[PDB]
Amino acid sequence: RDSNVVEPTEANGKKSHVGPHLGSRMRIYEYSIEHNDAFWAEIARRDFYWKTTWPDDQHVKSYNFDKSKGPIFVKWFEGAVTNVCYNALDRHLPAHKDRVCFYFEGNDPSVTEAVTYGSMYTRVVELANVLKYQYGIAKGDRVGLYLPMIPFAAVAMLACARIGAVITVIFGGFSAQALSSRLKDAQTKLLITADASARGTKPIPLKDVADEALKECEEEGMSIACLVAENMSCKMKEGRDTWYGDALARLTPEQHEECPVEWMDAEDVLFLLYTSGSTGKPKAIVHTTAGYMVYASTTFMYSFDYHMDDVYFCTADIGWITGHSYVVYGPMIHCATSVLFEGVPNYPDYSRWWQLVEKYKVSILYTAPTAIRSLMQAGDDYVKVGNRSTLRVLGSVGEPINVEAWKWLRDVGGEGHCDVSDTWWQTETGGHMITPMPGCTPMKPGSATLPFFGVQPVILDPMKLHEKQGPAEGLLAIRAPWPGMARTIYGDHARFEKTYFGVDGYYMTGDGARRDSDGYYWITGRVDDVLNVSGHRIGTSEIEDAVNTHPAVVESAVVGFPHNIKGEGIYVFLTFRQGTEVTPELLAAVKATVRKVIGPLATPDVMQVARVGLPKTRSGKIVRRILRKVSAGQYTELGDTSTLANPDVVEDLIAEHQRLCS
Ligand SMILES: Nc1ncnc2c1ncn2[C@@H]1O[C@H](COP(=O)(O)O)[C@@H](O)[C@H]1O
């Protein structure tokens, strides 16, 4: 056995749904691959409600991964009928009406509410009836959500699922321009938002931002209604904007108690989630109903070993896939009791998440390496004042975790009595794909370990594009379908086939990985050109285009660079027009332009002025390798300069970088 292996705790072994040692997991995994249809049919029948089941347990999937045979497609549970809201809520009643669904706390610690499953039912039937009868939302209509992490956010997702509407969630940190682009592309009929929120000391205007987005949408010929939850005096446009309290007042008494369920076919769309690509504008990843429901919920259960006596806390936002699968849908479908937190880990101070852990007796904590590294920098006293005795599983998602952060998470945060589930997956996969399972999986810090049940990863040789056996490094791909796979890109199946199915027979993840002699996977990062910043994808061209809209800017080039907290940061090289007075204020104005066009999440970390221009070939192409190496401080590895039309720029780029140090 490797010396870096960490054994699962004995207590987690005894509690595990799977078993106390690796053989228990491998027995199920083998069955889940060789009897793949029967496995998922048994899971689906065991753990979910179906109005109508699929016709044949031996054939719950049909698919084509080989473009030479025809269009790429995937279907799971075709013929079955179900509803995600019913599985998240109604079926838990009346037996669990008094069970807490969310222990909610606001940014302000004096704002708290324990929301039971019974109360969620009431809230969801009310909102669903508002949507049906006051907004005329019908099956398949698109509804945009621009909401903070408050109970109404989950209510809104589940109410739309209840009636068969398609949600598209826009992260609350996007700007108005980013919000409007998503509403226009999805052709939303309705925007659900809130008056405002707060994050630390920062006010978060939501309806004020939505006002600017809706004005742009109207200029484009759209008519989008807006429903505003009361979270914290807004301007309300007569005829377009309604306070949720006024909408509630229009309900009849029985509309507070009953709302018919729209029974959905298996491949009906559930949500669109706009995701940045290596090239081009963000595209909406499409997830349908039955396969996603099954996959998000089953991975929730096994990857975290969730039992009914556990209390769960995921720190992710609903604006991202982790918040879809592992705050709202997956946890509620398995009747989890969860912490729902509107705020940030450092307000009032850096003990906040630990205050939540101890107050609600959290036993499973799912967070991200950027956040962990921030907690590490703040100092261990903020952690050690908290009682962490209830923690038994800690999870990490979104980006690689290095050994030091992994060890700190387990041995400081979790006091050495936790297993750690480093879950590798992506927006397109619906749920966890490679992950430890508590109690049964020996862990290697920095490795995602073994594939989830029903998942067959492969390592493809980058040059020959065929599978490599045994220990190997190359392109991470998946050789067979799983229930949670995204079904298309909204309005662009051609781009979906091009991006993910360029090698016939495989789903191409866009990640590189190494598989070791124990079959454990080590994800080494994106092999395309998209950035993964604080755990979320952003494309360089989006940031460049935004930077270039500043009137003084001639040209820009954006690269990622290693960042000790965010993993990968945003480094901008740019040129200004002749005669520009370059000042700190001007650089701040260019940064503010990015923040207006995209949002704070896209704030450049470093802005370097290329006094003499960007390195370009004689054909005018920017030589990005040079900028990548400079931004990382790797001056000895710039590589070839002989194709540069302007080789005198290199000396300046290095000297300016050293002055900034970056
Ligand atoms: N556990 C992990 N380890 C390493 N990289 C990860 C992990 N989880 C997510 N990622 C990265 O995040 C990408 C998905 O980003 P996104 O879907 O935009 O949030 C993946 O393709 C990986 O590059």
From TrEMBL:
Membrane-traversing stretches: 149-174
Superkingdom of the organism of origin: Eukaryota
Keyword Nucleotide-binding: yes
Sequence ranges assigned to domain AMP-dependent synthetase/ligase in this UniProt record: 91-487
An annotated Gene Ontology molecular function: ATP binding
Binding site for CoA: R199, K202, D317, R595
Gene3D superfamilies: 3.30.300.30, N-terminal domain of ligase-like (3.40.50.12780)
Chemical reaction(s) catalysed: acetate + ATP + CoA = acetyl-CoA + AMP + diphosphate
Alphabetical list of CDD domains matching this protein: ACS
Domain Acetyl-coenzyme A synthetase N-terminal: 28-88
Domain AMP-binding enzyme C-terminal: 542-621
Keywords carried by this UniProt record: ATP-binding, Ligase, Membrane, Nucleotide-binding, Transmembrane, Transmembrane helix
EC primary class: ligase
Pfam family of the protein (one): ACAS_N
Binding site for AMP: G398, D422, T423, Q426, T427, D511, R526, N532, R537
EC number, as in UniProt: 6.2.1.1
Listed name of the protein: Acetyl-coenzyme A synthetase
Organism per entry: Leishmania infantum
